[PDB]
Design a protein around this nucleic acid. Sequence first.
DNA 1: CGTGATTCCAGCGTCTTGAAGTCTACATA
DNA 2: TATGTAGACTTCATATTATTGGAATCACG
RNA 3: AGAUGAGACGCGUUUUAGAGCUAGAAAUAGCAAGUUAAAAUAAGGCUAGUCCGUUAUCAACUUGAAAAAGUGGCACCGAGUCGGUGCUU
Length: 1357
Amino acid sequence: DKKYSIGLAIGTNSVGWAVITDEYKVPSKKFKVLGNTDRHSIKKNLIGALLFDSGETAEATRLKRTARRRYTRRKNRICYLQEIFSNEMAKVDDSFFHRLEESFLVEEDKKHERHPIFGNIVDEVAYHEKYPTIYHLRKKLVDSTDKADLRLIYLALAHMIKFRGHFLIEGDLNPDNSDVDKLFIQLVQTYNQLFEENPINASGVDAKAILSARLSKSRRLENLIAQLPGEKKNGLFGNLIALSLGLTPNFKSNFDLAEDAKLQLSKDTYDDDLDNLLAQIGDQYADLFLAAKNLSDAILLSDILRVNTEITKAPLSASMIKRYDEHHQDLTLLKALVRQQLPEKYKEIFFDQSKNGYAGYIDGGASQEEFYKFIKPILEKMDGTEELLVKLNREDLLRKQRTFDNGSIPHQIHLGELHAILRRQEDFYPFLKDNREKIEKILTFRIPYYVGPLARGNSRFAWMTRKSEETITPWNFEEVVDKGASAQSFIERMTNFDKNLPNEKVLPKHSLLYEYFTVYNELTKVKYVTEGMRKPAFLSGEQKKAIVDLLFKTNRKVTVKQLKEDYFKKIECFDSVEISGVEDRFNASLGTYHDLLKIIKDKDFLDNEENEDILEDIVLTLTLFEDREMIEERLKTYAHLFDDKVMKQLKRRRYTGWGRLSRKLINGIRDKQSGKTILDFLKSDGFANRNFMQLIHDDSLTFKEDIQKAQVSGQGDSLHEHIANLAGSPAIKKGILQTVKVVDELVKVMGRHKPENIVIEMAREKNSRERMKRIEEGIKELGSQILKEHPVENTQLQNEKLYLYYLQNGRDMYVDQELDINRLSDYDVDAIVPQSFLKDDSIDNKVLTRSDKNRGKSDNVPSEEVVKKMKNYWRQLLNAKLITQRKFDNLTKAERGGLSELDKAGFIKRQLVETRQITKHVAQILDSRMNTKYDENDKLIREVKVITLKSKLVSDFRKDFQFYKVREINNYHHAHDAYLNAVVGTALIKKYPKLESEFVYGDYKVYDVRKMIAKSEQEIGKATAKYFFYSNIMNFFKTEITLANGEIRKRPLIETNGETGEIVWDKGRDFATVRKVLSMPQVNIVKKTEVQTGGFSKESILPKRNSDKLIARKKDWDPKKYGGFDSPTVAYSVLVVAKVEKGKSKKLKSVKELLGITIMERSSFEKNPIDFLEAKGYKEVKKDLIIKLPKYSLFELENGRKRMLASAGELQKGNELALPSKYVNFLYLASHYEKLKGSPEDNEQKQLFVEQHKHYLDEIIEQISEFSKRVILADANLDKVLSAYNKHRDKPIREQAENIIHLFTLTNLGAPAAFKYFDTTIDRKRYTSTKEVLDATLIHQSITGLYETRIDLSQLG
DNA sequence: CGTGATTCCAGCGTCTTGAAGTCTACATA
DNA sequence: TATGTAGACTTCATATTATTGGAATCACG
RNA sequence: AGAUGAGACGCGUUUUAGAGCUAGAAAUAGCAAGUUAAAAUAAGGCUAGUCCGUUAUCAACUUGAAAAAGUGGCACCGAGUCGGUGCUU
């Protein structure tokens, strides 16, 4: 019944929880232990951690589910195609389909003849010889007009439909005119007919090879132009070739036109633009451009497939046949050459399936790239292989028909081939003629994005609403599914709700309102300085409107030069202007406005606000519904305002992505007194010009209050729903839920009381190239030659001193002293703002100088004399991006305003307030779960204060007072960090009452910079209630205060509250108490048990083998003939005490053994456990003794050895290592784990401490041994570690600890893992036997681990 | 003849966009 | 006519790793 | 730098078919051939659909078919995974 506080630290893999009283001790409690063991009470501390498997995302589940749906859909499509052929096939061959369906079974289990296609070996051999592959059959069917057997037609159709190719390309691309060279000849003929006086000789030019080569468009155009000595690329023929290749040529020069004749086939408007062009050029040239477009289509076809013969009626089959012929010829040549020149490598390449040779490439698992890499050196070594080497460079050597690059084949090719086959063979089979439309519909059927899966109220993923209850087929899909209702449901379901307003719809990424908001947001912080203006002024409403209209509505991108010239010079008549806040091209732009102006060609319509809503409905309509038909259907309602060309142009364009804000948050909510929305505020703000971040965080505006009101009550009362809907990764949400459960358990344990303070902080969860680019840009801007004199790479630039030296161009930021490399060790990095005023330690805050005394006087900011010295030097670095704007202003803070009260207030808020918002939601959950009562004023009684603090304060506290953390020694660091969280939070709230307004939730009123800030000097006694003149937060804990020049100040031995007089910190006992708490050997580490769910087993389908470990992939197909999956993931083990038949006599012998239940059999076991256990071979099962052991069950054996049952057959280390604080401090100091920043005298003292306590290293190697012999029992690894340590006893202490930190994985918690001591690698130790835990003590531990239930398994059986 | 130590392995790619580099008609001396 | 010169426009990328439990393999007292 | 969600594509993997031949009596040796196709692609279930099955959740005991609810004093001295003492019961 004593007042106490709870400290919680939340992490992705950990939840640390500690309990503190008001004396900063740690309470210890007696707990009863249930079960049949002798122990009936155990004393445990209230500080510990909870560990669990990291939360797994749902991406894998989504991918697997989609794959399964696609496979079922494809199988049903094949079934429909078989249905169409059912009658005719039964007329021709009554058992063909049954033979096709059962081909996978071996001869023993087959019901018909083993040969599928024809049922006799002779006809099968004839078919295979007459057609090597199905592509030969398809081409033969297409070209020939003779009647073919029904089975061949069925096989061709099935292979066409089962693999229909992608549907990315929309429209039509196969006009049956795709011969590149032939179309080029036709274009030349048309050009010669139109221009008889200027003919072009194209004879001898291999246009087909040039255009179809794997080269860029410009390169191919140049190559083709080079083949015509008398033609240039800017000529009419060159422009036509560029258009065919897909470039953007201008025909204005060729015909001396006034309008810029820019024609591109990608743009839809070309359809009109060409015709309008013809208006000036006449109708004679139309055929020329039609031939050019046909040639372009031929080139596009040639991009994806290669063909030479002109007799092709099927562009795909001919290409595959050509590739097959090339493969055959190259294989024969390669075999001959290998047998001739290098007979020693014949067997390896052509017989060994293990190797990456041809045998492994065809029969084994060798991929194409592996085979190319293996055969390239052999081909290079041999002679006469120039053809093969060229093919290998072109990646077309010994290829197959099924390759990874077939994923670009559009369905048009297969559709055309199927249409050709049906046209050829319908004259001999009437049903094909009658059902041609059905087959084409089956092949082209694509379930549209909006429609979604075709469920009937049994699936939680589908939202399709049908017009009638009937089976859905591709032939009648147009009428069964109601398009409009499904589209509306898709709109209302798919869109992601706004984070700020959970009940509002987010805007489209390219919506007009969102783009306006983005433009205005950055527009309100732009400033301009001219000659006549004394001080820069903010853009007024008239200026912003003029800039938007003249620039944002006329130029796609607005640059700094454009802003300065087109507006300030043209309108404001300013010759020189200095733009502040924005540099270079603006990030925001009105792209959608320009796109709509291009389409509708009505600027006034876009400028009309009344039509805006309609425009919005357009943007969303183009944001989603990729399918064209629905775009047309929905835009039909607005088709009355636009022409058919405009409607088609709107249909063609499609947008992507989404925005970040809702529509109401931009223009829906209005302030109480002003009566203006956010966009209205940005339009006319006047003096303030507050941005969106300031507008939503302005305490003087109702916007923040409305945001707070809308945020709460986001969903129902259920905790699970609130956890689920939190914006974050699954791991962090699991951590939050576990944290809530842990704090509820703690509330329960402490006698149904309620904590007075709860502290929660959440751990935060490439650069070298960026820093190198920044350095290069700065050097190029300055022109210095320091890089040539001192070259460096990214590996050596780890130390911040070198980075500062490069950023300073080998100079000093305080004096005009040239930097010396040999003096870099003597140099001391100093913070621009002293550590007393602010603990920033950032790179921009760091400055490298010869002597810190040169920084200036005791004033925090460096002296303004240094500013007068190096104003230009600093501004050059600022303009060269070497330094940041914040760093430049901090260097010049003394000149500008010294140390204004605003700087102090900002420092305090930055040190205190939490930037992220997830912590606020966690605090809201905790407050609603603790505060449940109201006062007389109907206001929530805030008994529990949920204070939140950043991790930086706790890290600084750890580093200040020799409280060092090592993230590899053990897992107590989570609990210790939670304990320090609680201590710091309680101390800070007690010391500073008013600042609690920022800590505790929004119920407390806000304050201002007036209080707690002294105008000048360190006023003694704090009479005016000013808490800290210095801008620190936690500096009162230490016994001294440093200054900028090096001056020192002292603090009282005991710190007490300023007003109430309560003691807040007893420096004579509090540090000793914290040391004792951190030195406690007993900390509660419990692993959260998780019954394993997931894949039934590894998905790699292993070949057949003579073992029982294989699991059948189907009910009938036993694994002894067809192989199957292996290594199932055991969901949870089951301890059964029963008897099993033994020997030929089947004698029942009592056995106690662990049985693993797979995920596949889990449902069967959980339905009828007794029947399943009997089926596996257990007789007379003790139902009451069946004990469920999930993964991570805890076992204790003699001498405190702990194990975790990771599965049915592998155990994990279950013990933690409790090290004294002195050894941890020695390990952290000696290893230089973090940066060595600090006072040089302090660094020297730490180095002396490291040197004087070297022998501790040996002690550590002792303790692990004494630990290992009672915990790990891995003698070989321990001996190898001892030998390696003895070998490296002479290594320097700088690197004699970086290896010992990695050495602790030997006796760590979790799964065993291999490590490396210097160059000697110690492999992981495996526990292949779990028989011992059958005679150990099982420990059922509560979620926080305070309660126990010990079961002595030895007392069974 | 388990038994303990050692070795190898696990289903995976794409569905557009933006900065980079460059060629160009045009302004100015 | 020679040299910038903004500008329009094609081009080359536009994410990496990882545990840890199963099974196989093999020396071995 | 926040998660969930709809539609396709390309493969990969496993069995079978594409009679391997010659000299041996087999074991073996030599020679020819390599591309493709059918089925499956988590066991399967009922709700029988172009549905659903790898996300979230899950200590023990008692009640409740489930959703959920309820279960065990405290103080002090120390510290090798907690022990001892006092008090209460």
